[PDB]
Design an enzyme around this catalytic site. Structure first.
Site, PDB file in Angstrom:
ATOM      1  N   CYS A 117      69.429   7.485   3.050  1.00 43.23           N
ATOM      2  CA  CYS A 117      70.483   6.485   2.956  1.00 43.23           C
ATOM      3  C   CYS A 117      70.940   6.098   4.354  1.00 43.23           C
ATOM      4  O   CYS A 117      71.443   6.942   5.097  1.00 43.23           O
ATOM      5  CB  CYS A 117      71.660   7.012   2.136  1.00 43.23           C
ATOM      6  N   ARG A 120      75.336   6.285   5.294  1.00 43.83           N
ATOM      7  CA  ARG A 120      76.146   7.492   5.162  1.00 43.83           C
ATOM      8  C   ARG A 120      77.316   7.600   6.142  1.00 43.83           C
ATOM      9  O   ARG A 120      78.021   8.615   6.091  1.00 43.83           O
ATOM     10  CB  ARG A 120      75.262   8.720   5.314  1.00 43.83           C
ATOM     11  N   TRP A 289      77.555  -0.936  -1.495  1.00 42.59           N
ATOM     12  CA  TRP A 289      77.315  -2.354  -1.278  1.00 42.59           C
ATOM     13  C   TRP A 289      75.916  -2.506  -0.678  1.00 42.59           C
ATOM     14  O   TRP A 289      75.290  -1.529  -0.277  1.00 42.59           O
ATOM     15  CB  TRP A 289      78.417  -2.989  -0.406  1.00 42.59           C
ATOM     16  N   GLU A 294      67.649  -5.492   1.236  1.00 42.59           N
ATOM     17  CA  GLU A 294      67.356  -5.001  -0.108  1.00 42.59           C
ATOM     18  C   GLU A 294      67.086  -6.154  -1.061  1.00 42.59           C
ATOM     19  O   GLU A 294      66.143  -6.113  -1.864  1.00 42.59           O
ATOM     20  CB  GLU A 294      68.527  -4.161  -0.631  1.00 42.59           C
TER      21      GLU A 294
HETATM   22  C1  HEM Z   1      78.357   2.101   1.171  1.00 39.32           C
HETATM   23  C2  HEM Z   1      77.292   1.331   1.420  1.00 39.32           C
HETATM   24  C3  HEM Z   1      75.840   1.855   1.268  1.00 39.32           C
HETATM   25  C4  HEM Z   1      74.782   1.253   1.815  1.00 39.32           C
HETATM   26  C5  HEM Z   1      74.821  -0.025   2.678  1.00 39.32           C
HETATM   27  C6  HEM Z   1      73.591   2.000   1.450  1.00 39.32           C
HETATM   28  C7  HEM Z   1      72.301   1.694   1.828  1.00 39.32           C
HETATM   29  C8  HEM Z   1      71.167   2.267   1.286  1.00 39.32           C
HETATM   30  C9  HEM Z   1      69.846   1.678   1.265  1.00 39.32           C
HETATM   31  C10 HEM Z   1      69.503   0.296   1.852  1.00 39.32           C
HETATM   32  C11 HEM Z   1      69.015   2.531   0.669  1.00 39.32           C
HETATM   33  C12 HEM Z   1      67.510   2.282   0.420  1.00 39.32           C
HETATM   34  C13 HEM Z   1      67.430   1.815  -1.027  1.00 39.32           C
HETATM   35  C14 HEM Z   1      66.056   1.369  -1.420  1.00 39.32           C
HETATM   36  O1  HEM Z   1      65.303   0.866  -0.546  1.00 39.32           O
HETATM   37  O2  HEM Z   1      65.733   1.512  -2.624  1.00 39.32           O
HETATM   38  C15 HEM Z   1      69.788   3.695   0.274  1.00 39.32           C
HETATM   39  C16 HEM Z   1      69.335   4.826  -0.364  1.00 39.32           C
HETATM   40  C17 HEM Z   1      70.128   5.812  -0.934  1.00 39.32           C
HETATM   41  N1  HEM Z   1      71.517   5.822  -0.963  1.00 39.32           N
HETATM   42 FE1  HEM Z   1      72.828   4.680   0.188  1.00 39.32          FE
HETATM   43  N2  HEM Z   1      73.972   3.081   0.680  1.00 39.32           N
HETATM   44  C18 HEM Z   1      75.365   3.020   0.521  1.00 39.32           C
HETATM   45  C19 HEM Z   1      76.143   3.902  -0.219  1.00 39.32           C
HETATM   46  C20 HEM Z   1      75.706   5.001  -0.926  1.00 39.32           C
HETATM   47  C21 HEM Z   1      76.473   5.848  -1.820  1.00 39.32           C
HETATM   48  C22 HEM Z   1      77.968   5.623  -2.176  1.00 39.32           C
HETATM   49  C23 HEM Z   1      75.638   6.794  -2.292  1.00 39.32           C
HETATM   50  C24 HEM Z   1      75.912   7.977  -3.246  1.00 39.32           C
HETATM   51  C25 HEM Z   1      77.119   8.537  -3.344  1.00 39.32           C
HETATM   52  C26 HEM Z   1      74.335   6.597  -1.686  1.00 39.32           C
HETATM   53  C27 HEM Z   1      73.207   7.366  -1.888  1.00 39.32           C
HETATM   54  C28 HEM Z   1      71.914   6.977  -1.625  1.00 39.32           C
HETATM   55  C29 HEM Z   1      70.728   7.700  -2.021  1.00 39.32           C
HETATM   56  C30 HEM Z   1      70.699   9.051  -2.765  1.00 39.32           C
HETATM   57  C31 HEM Z   1      69.662   7.021  -1.602  1.00 39.32           C
HETATM   58  C32 HEM Z   1      68.196   7.465  -1.811  1.00 39.32           C
HETATM   59  C33 HEM Z   1      67.732   6.944  -3.166  1.00 39.32           C
HETATM   60  C34 HEM Z   1      66.283   7.281  -3.384  1.00 39.32           C
HETATM   61  O3  HEM Z   1      65.767   8.272  -2.789  1.00 39.32           O
HETATM   62  O4  HEM Z   1      65.660   6.544  -4.181  1.00 39.32           O
HETATM   63  N3  HEM Z   1      74.416   5.494  -0.883  1.00 39.32           N
HETATM   64  N4  HEM Z   1      71.097   3.502   0.677  1.00 39.32           N
HETATM   65  N1  LIG Z   2      59.629   0.982  -7.774  1.00 37.81           N
HETATM   66  C1  LIG Z   2      58.990   1.970  -8.238  1.00 37.81           C
HETATM   67  N2  LIG Z   2      59.470   3.233  -8.173  1.00 37.81           N
HETATM   68  C2  LIG Z   2      60.669   3.523  -7.590  1.00 37.81           C
HETATM   69  C3  LIG Z   2      60.797   4.545  -6.645  1.00 37.81           C
HETATM   70  C4  LIG Z   2      62.036   4.815  -6.054  1.00 37.81           C
HETATM   71  C5  LIG Z   2      63.155   4.061  -6.420  1.00 37.81           C
HETATM   72  C6  LIG Z   2      64.531   4.293  -5.833  1.00 37.81           C
HETATM   73  C7  LIG Z   2      65.379   3.043  -6.071  1.00 37.81           C
HETATM   74  N3  LIG Z   2      66.757   3.264  -5.618  1.00 37.81           N
HETATM   75  C8  LIG Z   2      67.552   2.021  -5.746  1.00 37.81           C
HETATM   76  C9  LIG Z   2      68.677   2.138  -4.752  1.00 37.81           C
HETATM   77  C10 LIG Z   2      68.992   3.429  -4.367  1.00 37.81           C
HETATM   78  C11 LIG Z   2      70.006   3.656  -3.452  1.00 37.81           C
HETATM   79  C12 LIG Z   2      70.669   2.573  -2.909  1.00 37.81           C
HETATM   80  C13 LIG Z   2      70.384   1.265  -3.293  1.00 37.81           C
HETATM   81  N4  LIG Z   2      71.067   0.235  -2.715  1.00 37.81           N
HETATM   82  C14 LIG Z   2      72.361   0.290  -2.365  1.00 37.81           C
HETATM   83  N5  LIG Z   2      72.834  -0.382  -1.406  1.00 37.81           N
HETATM   84  C15 LIG Z   2      73.280   1.179  -3.109  1.00 37.81           C
HETATM   85  C16 LIG Z   2      73.295   1.580  -4.408  1.00 37.81           C
HETATM   86  C17 LIG Z   2      74.369   2.432  -4.501  1.00 37.81           C
HETATM   87  C18 LIG Z   2      74.984   2.528  -3.264  1.00 37.81           C
HETATM   88  O1  LIG Z   2      74.282   1.740  -2.378  1.00 37.81           O
HETATM   89  C19 LIG Z   2      69.357   1.039  -4.219  1.00 37.81           C
HETATM   90  C20 LIG Z   2      63.031   3.054  -7.366  1.00 37.81           C
HETATM   91  C21 LIG Z   2      61.803   2.795  -7.948  1.00 37.81           C
HETATM   92  C22 LIG Z   2      57.667   1.630  -8.844  1.00 37.81           C
HETATM   93  C23 LIG Z   2      56.820   0.556  -8.633  1.00 37.81           C
HETATM   94  C24 LIG Z   2      55.744   0.755  -9.474  1.00 37.81           C
HETATM   95  C25 LIG Z   2      55.949   1.933 -10.179  1.00 37.81           C
HETATM   96  O2  LIG Z   2      57.160   2.481  -9.787  1.00 37.81           O
END
Ligand code: HEM
Ligand code: A1BTY
Ligand code: HEM
Ligand code: A1BTY
Ligand code: H4B
Ligand code: H4B
Ligand code: ZN
Lengths: 419, 415
Positions: A117, A120, A289, A294
């Site tokens: 993330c 953070r 947000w 994204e």
């Molecule tokens: C406050 C503004 C925040 C921004 C701008 C942000 C931004 C991002 C972005 C751009 C990603 C990559 C997502 C993707 O490509 O699918 C990400 C991943 C992630 N975010 Fe943040 N985030 C925010 C808040 C949070 C919050 C509030 C949480 C949880 C309490 C969080 C937990 C995570 C986690 C666990 C991932 C990894 C998800 C995965 O492995 O699929 N984020 N974040």
């Molecule tokens: N897409 C596939 N798999 C797949 C693998 C990994 C993922 C993780 C997706 N997390 C979506 C995600 C996670 C965390 C943050 C955001 N954004 C924010 N800002 C945000 C949300 C909350 C706070 O902040 C978006 C999703 C899908 C796939 C393609 C073909 C087969 O599987």
């Protein structure tokens, strides 16, 4: 021993000792690196199903120890009583219940430990809605609606998580079946093509197969599919007045609005598992947000997503016969200017990839200075466009797995037995 | 395990890696921490006899397996012959065939190289008979003339004598064969390429008279047999250069930008069968972003985003206008259009990444894997719109390999 990381642009060197506290395997070894595998490891802290005492209690003792250490107790009366209390509870129910303070601490630290993330720097500013008293899908929907309203805040988005009852025996799981609280449907067309969001075609068919009447558009907000206490999931329509949406226009290309693109303002991840002291919260929708990339890079320009590059490029009158014209790259930039301009025009919180990555570098400095480290996954932190003109590209990072954490979990329709 | 699987999340193709079982050297990661983004995870340190025996054996076995002669009598005699040399001389000499095979497989095994679909088309120049820096210069000139080929670039490597005791190393002190000088000014500004300031200073100190311009080709600083290095000016008719103009912006050519056609890496070490070739300059051709994104737009480099954005009339007061991103694309359009119009070989990041996916799948088919470093394989711009971004990759270290080595001015005993 004690590992250093260097930023090759500024020459700042940081010294990591926090990695000495990581417990779970990354997937890598001395001979193979799995840093670009999406799910490299299946190492879990607990077994398949309801653990025995010698399995759950050590994880619990570790979490309680850590939390009481965080507040400069450890060994205090309250800490020793808390250990006794968790001990008797596991003895008598095979599980235990987190105090409200512990639950807030663990959620914030799951976010603080989220290696992937970029956002953070905000980790300690997180509204935690305790929903562990919930019992039915209607109650889940009420809790989620309140979450969406609070988090949206008329565009001034606020970070929030709602935590539903933890997993007990694995057969009574609470689940949000949606991957995000707000997403668009995708429809498989007869002429082979796809309408709306192709990523959501399967979930949309489940919804239709559950009685949902699809309007069959390009931007149909999906219904909620909510499962409480292992029961069959139930459909709910989020009241549209709660779904903040941003029409996408361009500050110089007037024709851009005629593409008919919009997106929602609130990204709310609802398919992950929250792990705290061996407790598993299978339904913990969290929102914050967006970073503009994204939407404008991945949602709009992935080939298996909305795939709007050709249309935008054509309207831009770009040389599209060969790759070397960089027409995709030109359109990609214009789309991302548009997304940013539209959110900022409607005063909906958004952060661009330049500001977001700069903030993460500053978060990294803080974490090393007070915590001795910060786990960070370079593959996910670096934005999907203009990588090397953001600071994180030039920053070495150490990735390791700290608990509490957010984990992946299986989609419930691969596991659910209907009734 | 016994199999490992990688998935492409855009196509859902899944490949099965068995080749990682053959890796022997470290990645730098541990079971509990990943170092995938660390860039680097004594002269006396040359291998003992006992250390060299199994490394030589492994490589000779690999070579004879590659040519479908494993177990053959030639294989058994070669093995016995190599052992005699190690016993008698503490080292051994590769046959020409083995040198060529090793050089090619170091390229094939370079996990950070996106251009490996060409690995088996590599012209190997055996320079192991070289003894003086004048000789190295001669070899390097011929390499440049061949590789450049009037703009139709051909990949090539020139291999100088292997390391002996660590006190007689051949080194090219240059980091590339062709590279622009950089000069720090009293006012703190920089003329030329800021990345090359330290090497420019070493050159001047050795007697180079610098023109003090923005694109001065540096001289060669060549070290033979561990002697003090010597300066040589590459003949200018051999340095092919491309003036950078834009297909639509009339003004772009007035930035006065140019670059050289031939990327030729001269500071790495090639390890074949335990032998270390400390001087092994190799060349291919450019992917456009190496110049347009890194060379021109890194803040520590030529850093021209601000000047280009100005000429483009972009609003530069706030990041969210994405003026930097917009200016970056136009610069990379120019680089590609300029090389193409001058018929100087170049590859854009889209073509290159797609070829690498095709190459990677073929390697999985015929070889059981393909070590790959996603952090390096994904281009420095527009990452997710290229196919490698969505490609899972496994990174591991096979030998023969190209290796990093210390800068020679950090270890050289001046005579
Ligand atoms: C406050 C503004 C925040 C921004 C701008 C942000 C931004 C991002 C972005 C751009 C990603 C990559 C997502 C993707 O490509 O699918 C990400 C991943 C992630 N975010 Fe943040 N985030 C925010 C808040 C949070 C919050 C509030 C949480 C949880 C309490 C969080 C937990 C995570 C986690 C666990 C991932 C990894 C998800 C995965 O492995 O699929 N984020 N974040
Ligand atoms: N897409 C596939 N798999 C797949 C693998 C990994 C993922 C993780 C997706 N997390 C979506 C995600 C996670 C965390 C943050 C955001 N954004 C924010 N800002 C945000 C949300 C909350 C706070 O902040 C978006 C999703 C899908 C796939 C393609 C073909 C087969 O599987
Ligand atoms: C033929 C066309 C080639 C192309 C298009 C190409 C492309 C690239 C690119 C873009 C990089 C990253 C460069 C950087 O960011 O610094 C790279 C790295 C590398 N290339 Fe290739 N390359 C080619 C040929 C070769 C050849 C002929 C060799 C050796 C015989 C080679 C060996 C390597 C190695 C060892 C690296 C890793 C560099 C490092 O670790 O710092 N490449 N390649
Ligand atoms: N400069 C620094 N570090 C640093 C910089 C760069 C490196 C590795 C650079 N490999 C340069 C390189 C390597 C391989 C290929 C190419 N290109 C080609 N097309 C090509 C050449 C031959 C065939 O194809 C370029 C390692 C360390 C730094 C920053 C701050 C302090 O130091
Ligand atoms: C810190 C980080 O590992 C470093 O900036 C890497 C990132 N990826 C790269 N990728 C390529 N092709 N070349 C590089 O120099 C780098 N640098
Ligand atoms: C194969 C590769 O790991 C995969 O495509 C990753 C790359 N980096 C990413 N980075 C972010 N932020 N989000 C992603 O979904 C991905 N996908
Ligand atoms: Zn790793």
């Amino acid at each position: 021993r004690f590992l250093k990381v260097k930023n090759w642009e500024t020459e700042v060197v940081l010294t990591d000792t926090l990695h000495l506290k990581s417990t779970l395997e990354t997937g890598c070894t001395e001979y193979i690196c799995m840093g670009s595998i999406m799910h490299p490891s299946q190492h879990a802290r607990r077994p398949e199903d309801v653990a025995t005492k010698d399995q759950l209690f050590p994880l619990a003792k570790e979490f309680i120890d850590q939390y009481y250490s965080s507040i400069k107790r450890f060994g205090s009366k309250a800490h020793m009583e808390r250990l006794e209390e968790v001990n008797k509870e596991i003895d008598t129910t095979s599980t235990y219940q987190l105090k409200d303070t512990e639950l807030i601490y663990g959620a914030k630290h799951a976010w603080r430990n989220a290696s992937r993330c970029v956002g953070r720097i905000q980790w300690s500013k997180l509204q935690v809605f305790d929903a562990r008293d919930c019992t039915t899908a209607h109650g889940m929907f009420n809790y989620i609606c309140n979450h969406v309203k609070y988090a949206t805040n008329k565009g001034n988005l606020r970070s929030a998580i709602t935590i539903f009852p933890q997993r007990t025996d694995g057969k009574h799981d609470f689940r949000v079946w949606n991957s995000q609280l707000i997403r668009y449907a995708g429809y498989k067309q007869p002429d082979g093509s796809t309408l709306g969001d192709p990523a959501n075609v399967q979930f949309t068919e489940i919804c239709i197969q559950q009685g949902w009447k699809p309007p069959r558009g390009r931007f149909d907000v999906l219904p909620l599919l909510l499962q409480a206490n292992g029961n069959d999931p139930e459909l709910f329509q989020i009241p549209p007045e709660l779904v903040l949406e941003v029409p996408i226009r361009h500050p110089k290309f007037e024709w851009f609005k005629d593409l008919g693109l919009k997106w929602y303002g609130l990204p709310a991840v609802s398919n992950m598992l929250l792990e705290i002291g061996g407790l598993e919260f299978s339904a913990c929708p969290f929102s914050g947000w967006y970073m503009g990339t994204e939407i404008g890079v991945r949602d709009y320009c992935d080939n298996s997503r909305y795939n709007i590059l050709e249309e935008v490029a054509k309207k831009m009158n770009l040389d599209m016969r060969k790759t070397s014209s960089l027409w995709k790259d030109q359109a990609l930039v214009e789309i991302n200017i548009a997304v940013l301009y539209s959110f900022q025009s409607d005063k909906v919180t958004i952060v661009d990839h330049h500001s977001a990555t700069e903030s993460f570098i500053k978060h990294m400095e803080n974490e090393y200075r007070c915590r001795g480290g910060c786990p960070a996954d370079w593959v996910w932190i670096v934005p999907p466009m203009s990588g090397s003109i953001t600071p994180v590209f030039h920053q070495e990072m150490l990735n390791y797995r700290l608990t509490p954490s957010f984990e992946y979990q299986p989609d419930p329709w691969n596991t659910h037995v209907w009734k």
